[PDB]
A paper describes a structure:
pmcChaperonins prevent protein aggregation and promote correct folding through ATP-driven cycles of binding, encapsulation, and release of substrate proteins. GroEL subunits assemble into a tetradecameric complex composed of two back-to-back rings that surround a central cavity. Each GroEL monomer is divided into three domains: the nucleotide-binding equatorial domain, the apical domain that binds GroES and substrate, and an intermediate hinge domain. GroEL binds to non-native proteins through two apical domain helices (helices H and I) that form a hydrophobic collar around the entrance of each GroEL cavity.
We formed binary complexes of wild-type E. coli GroEL bound to the model substrate protein R. Rubrum Rubisco. A 4.4 Å cryoEM map of GroEL-Rubisco was reconstructed from 65,453 particles. Extra density inside the GroEL cavities was attributed to bound non-native Rubisco. At a moderate contour level (5.0σ), Rubisco density in the top ring represented the full volume estimated for a folded Rubisco monomer (~61,000 Å3). Non-native Rubisco was positioned at the level of the GroEL apical domains. At these lower contour levels, Rubisco density filled the top GroEL cavity and contacted all seven GroEL subunits via helix H, helix I, and the underlying hydrophobic segment. The strongest contacts to Rubisco were in helix I, consistent with previous cryoEM studies of different GroEL-substrate complexes. However, we also identified substrate-binding residues located at the C-terminal end of helix I, including M267, R268, and I270. Perhaps most surprising is the interaction with the positively charged residue R268, which was consistently the strongest interacting residue in our cryoEM reconstructions. However, our cryoEM reconstruction showed Rubisco bound in both rings simultaneously, albeit with different occupancies.
Numbering used by the authors:
A (entry chain N), B (entry chain E), C (entry chain D): 2 to 525
D (entry chain H): 413 to 525
Amino acid sequence: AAKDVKFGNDARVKMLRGVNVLADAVKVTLGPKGRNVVLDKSFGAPTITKDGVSVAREIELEDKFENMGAQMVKEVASKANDAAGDGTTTATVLAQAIITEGLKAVAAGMNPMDLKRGIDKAVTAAVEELKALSVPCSDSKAIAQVGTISANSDETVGKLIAEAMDKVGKEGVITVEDGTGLQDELDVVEGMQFDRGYLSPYFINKPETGAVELESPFILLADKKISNIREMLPVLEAVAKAGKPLLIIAEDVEGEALATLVVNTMRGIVKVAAVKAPGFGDRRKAMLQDIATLTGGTVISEEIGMELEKATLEDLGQAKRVVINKDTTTIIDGVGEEAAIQGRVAQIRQQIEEATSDYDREKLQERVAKLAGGVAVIKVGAATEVEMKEKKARVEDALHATRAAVEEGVVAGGGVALIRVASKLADLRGQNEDQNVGIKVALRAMEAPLRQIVLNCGEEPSVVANTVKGGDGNYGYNAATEEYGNMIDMGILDPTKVTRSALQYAASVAGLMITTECMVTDLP
Amino acid sequence: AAKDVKFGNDARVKMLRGVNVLADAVKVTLGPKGRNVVLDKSFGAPTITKDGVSVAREIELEDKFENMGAQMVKEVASKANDAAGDGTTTATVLAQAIITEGLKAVAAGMNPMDLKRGIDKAVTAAVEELKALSVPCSDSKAIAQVGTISANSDETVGKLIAEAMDKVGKEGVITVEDGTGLQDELDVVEGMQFDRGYLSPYFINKPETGAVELESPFILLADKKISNIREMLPVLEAVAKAGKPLLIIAEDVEGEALATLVVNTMRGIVKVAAVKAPGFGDRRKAMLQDIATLTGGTVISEEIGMELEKATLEDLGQAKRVVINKDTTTIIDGVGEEAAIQGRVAQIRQQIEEATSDYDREKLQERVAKLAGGVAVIKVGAATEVEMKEKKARVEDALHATRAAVEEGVVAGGGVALIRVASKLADLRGQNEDQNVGIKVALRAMEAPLRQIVLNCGEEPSVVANTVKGGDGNYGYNAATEEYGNMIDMGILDPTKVTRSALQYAASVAGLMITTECMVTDLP
Amino acid sequence: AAKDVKFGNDARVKMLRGVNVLADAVKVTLGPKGRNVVLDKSFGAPTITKDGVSVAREIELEDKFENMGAQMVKEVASKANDAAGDGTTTATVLAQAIITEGLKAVAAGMNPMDLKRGIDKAVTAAVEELKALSVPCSDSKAIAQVGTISANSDETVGKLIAEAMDKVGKEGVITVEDGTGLQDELDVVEGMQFDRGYLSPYFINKPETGAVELESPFILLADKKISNIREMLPVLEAVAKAGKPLLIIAEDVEGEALATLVVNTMRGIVKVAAVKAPGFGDRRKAMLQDIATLTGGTVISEEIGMELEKATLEDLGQAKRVVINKDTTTIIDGVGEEAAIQGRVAQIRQQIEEATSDYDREKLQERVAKLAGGVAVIKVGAATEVEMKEKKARVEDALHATRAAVEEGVVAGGGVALIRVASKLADLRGQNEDQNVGIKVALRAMEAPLRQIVLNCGEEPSVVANTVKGGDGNYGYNAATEEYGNMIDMGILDPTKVTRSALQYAASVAGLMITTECMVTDLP
Amino acid sequence: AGGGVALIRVASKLADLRGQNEDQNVGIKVALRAMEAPLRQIVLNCGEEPSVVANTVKGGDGNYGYNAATEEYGNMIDMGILDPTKVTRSALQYAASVAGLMITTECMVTDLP
């Protein structure tokens, strides 16, 4: 197909215009005073919302180059959620703030490379300053404060989350499910989570949640390549007869099997999920055996001598629930026997004692920790289903926030930490004038999010920005009360991880984009 | 009338367009490798010329705003010519460089005030360094070298220039006249020069020369306003009867008399020109008295009861020749008697001895210097009239150059000194990013002349400029021979004053441009 | 007035277009096979012609830049006529070829000034080659051969020219006048010719002749500037009363006097011709005195105290006829008495005896020769005025040709000399590829005119071109006979001067044009 | 050596190559001048003025050249900025082949839009 080509100035300015469109469309939601956006729904009624994530997913421009520019920033910003639940809006705002001045500098004419390297130096210094400014949060009381703050001051949810974390350490896996009644329950159950996403978004039965949820699904553990549906005919027939869902845990699925499963999911003929086995090689095999033990199924591999055309519900693994995402997957309430689990635990512990290699010993330590940590599930109870669901959503939000908090302490929110570190790093310099103007650009961008928040409030931005910069420490301007003081004292704060991730990703996109000479795309 | 108004970018871009068009039309003539430019002339065939001054004078753009920019640049750059001979090409090339870079920086969003301040500071530093690098010219040998260089290897012309300089002192006014015979002559005749010029271009009997010349005209000495032509009635009647030209020196001329003289010259009724009386007040009165003594004329005043309507041919002074310019006016070969001249000289000497006040002492000192020995003139003899003509032209140019030399020394030519000082002034810095960028802009800009010259040669301008910058002292690249070496040896020396004035004027125009925000121009 | 400005290739393309149209309109006429061209005449019926000079004179293009190029080429070619009448078409063809090749090379990127230098060096080599190849033209036999060749093989006019040349030596000025009978007459008459043309184009009573002719006009010798018609009142009125024509010779005529004389000529009030005095200063005064002695008039100047306001017909000198050319003026049949002529001749002879320097002796020798050589008149005789007129025109052309031939030898025609030197100059080279390509351009283009003539013959051009190149000496292709052989034997030949000047002028135009980068024209 | 340093050096080494006519000579000059193109382009990508570094490298001999990474000079071999001979030779030869085939193009046949 004939491809249009643009070089230098025109291409970069087109991308900049697209980026400005996206930023103007998204940032308006930022801040407690966040405005509203309306999303056209051709089939039915429109929906109001403030979720920058939703607005971003909806944005798609007409001109190809503008669409290109918008989409790249969308893609990078999405990873803010993958990192720490929230932050996409901050990432996009920083992207616009950097890129505007950066491309202005380019147009004026300076070594774009030197500008990029200066940006990177400034961002690294910013990361160091964030680490210095961070405040740890591991105590139960601080954890509860963070959680309730995230959930809009719900001490009950905060306490529940803190109790779950105490019960299963701060590394265990936590999940949420609907409470049977008004009360709430904190359980301990077998299961395990591993860094594996879904093989195709089509598997998503819960698109609004951006996840895959399955109830009492069968489990398949085939440690080998998968390309042909013919291999899965008997298990598929048995699953259809039973009516329960299926899960596919294999080395990989492609070709005919992949296409057939995709078609079935698209037409909803059968609900089944697939994901690549965690890890690789020998440790992957060991983890698969562990999963079989925990699930009550059986590992099947041609090297062992059994075929997928002979597998039956008896040796197929079974569990009462599982959850899968674009990134991670977890097992809920397996079927494996606790005695067998303990035997496997002792076996792997003995293997650890045998393991002289430090790396392999750490791998086995992680495996045994995952196996023995079980799983903790919190049951959300409310008078009405609506209340239950809202509390569940807030619980997930606070759980993500607390995860990030235990990960990287916490810092004052409202972009206050960003502007504070910006003021601190005012005397950073590079190896050339272009690099130094890059430093200036980086700082001018880091000043943006607070200005946007204030603009949303109504008061003139630069006034409050300068006042806060003149302040120090945790000092800042609370939008909620439209006053000044300490965010930590006022109870507003952000998980340092989100700020770090947003700044780093914004710097990455700016660096990639400022170094674009030729674009190419398909003609209409 | 309704006016078209532009603000900011919409206006500065247009001024940049006009300036760039003018620069592209002019600079091509720079350097010993100057190209050819065809200038239209709606009488017959077009004229090929290499005179950047003529090219600029002819340049004028259709668009109102582009014409505005081009005309203002022309006007200001012309001051370099008026001060130190040629001036124009270097002034325009510089102005273009600084204006382009400054507008690019301003579009880059930098404080224009600080940009202008930095440019001016760099100009100051460059002026000081150039003065330091100046090669003094205080000897007959150096004067002759400069003269022959200016006249393209004319040792005899240089020798004549040196002889005249010695005869009439360095500051002594000098001019040239067509030689009567083959041999050249250096005579001394009574005359005087004062910093005044004609009032209307219509008085220019020799528009090609840009100067007014009259042979044995009459001289008017009325130190009062010329209210009405009634005063000029008997004067013009007697002048027409005598069939002679007439020179008018008056304190002031009103609109009626000015327009009457304008129409008289347009119709050529009488060869009459007007010039402001030198100086003002008492010193003006004294100078007019001295002029009367020199010319044999009579002072006309109401205090003495002597009015113009009663004036006769006797009252007006005479002098065999006269020359006038934009601001330079000289009386040549006055008719007054040496006895009266000596008497006035003695009177002024006694006044000097009586002068307790310094200011008045120096006033009388320049008066006596002006009156001492009158003027020395060059008789440009040649075998044929053509030879006489071009010898006279080149001799006048060399005279201007030698004046500039004896004034402000001399430096390496071809604009090399500009880069020689720019490289040395790299360490200069301002009080913020804006001033720093302005300084760097000026530092880059000064390269323009040499780079344009080498480009005309066709060699790699960047390579040659880098080599010269690596060089030192008067070492440089002779575009004429396409060789390197010390510019002093090959004798390509540019007068210091012309370069200084060109740089100053370019800086002034650049500052006024950058500081401009709004234009008002008539609707096209 | 705003001007349209063009640059670079987009500028020189229009110059090339203009030159191409001019060449395609002129060159076709060149050669014995000259194709007819018909010129517009608003008066009515058009005119068929092959006069390339006329065709060029009548060319004017709509586009301003094409007009510029065509006018420049026309004016430069005009110098071919100025030199020897012929050669204008040859110059135009050479200009077309050189310009096309040079602009093509410039498009190739070759350095323009290096190209120009190569062109000029090759041209100088060709000049010296032709100088070597020249065959002397002198003595009765060669004079008669040249004359009859010029007059289309008319031994009659050839013999007349030879007899006149013998009568009046070599440098003796000769003239052509209408006779009174069938037979012809040679004579010695009093007159003189000086290098001064008409002071206004309106003085050309014979526009077809491009020269002034007056029958027994009065002669005015005013050795002073002439600015006002008031000076010429009495003489003009006396001339009008007498009804005779008037000739004006003055040191300078300008301003109101010139304007009034032009108005009178346009209105036919009085037949007046104006010309500047010869030379300058002392030699000008001496020549004016000699002219007065020859004419019987009196020199008028303020130095003697005699004013033109008192001049009379008796005061003015008289001669039966006078002629003024584009650049030279001649007086025929002066009234000055032989006694006075001998007296002045002896005075100047004594002055020669007192003469010291070779410069003075040569000047005086030239003056005495011009005075004492007299003049000869070719009284064309024939049966009818028509044939008399054609014979007169042929005599004029043959006189020009013979003058040039005796001046600078003579060489074969048909550009065969050009191609011969082109062949001889294969070896030449230069310091760089640009110089070499310039040389090749020069040779190839200089080879063009013979190809054009052949193309007019209807034969294949390159065949004859290479045949001649293979040939040697004066061997060539006689277009009239359509046969090869020696030009000298077949009586085909042209003056050396005409071809030399044509080549030089074409080279000069090519250099000037290729050195063009910027063009400025009035807006259409 | 890499960075087009070998190509520019050889191009320098071919100063006085010649052909049987000026057309061949200009063809050779075109080839040699084109040889420099990669080094000039990479220098431009550095953002600094190309001809400077081009002539600077042409002045030296052996392996002296320009390093983009360090922005400095030295023995390109010692910094390890080097390429296999085969790749550069094949690139030059293929470029020459395609250029010759293109320059020898007179007529064109293709389908309409």
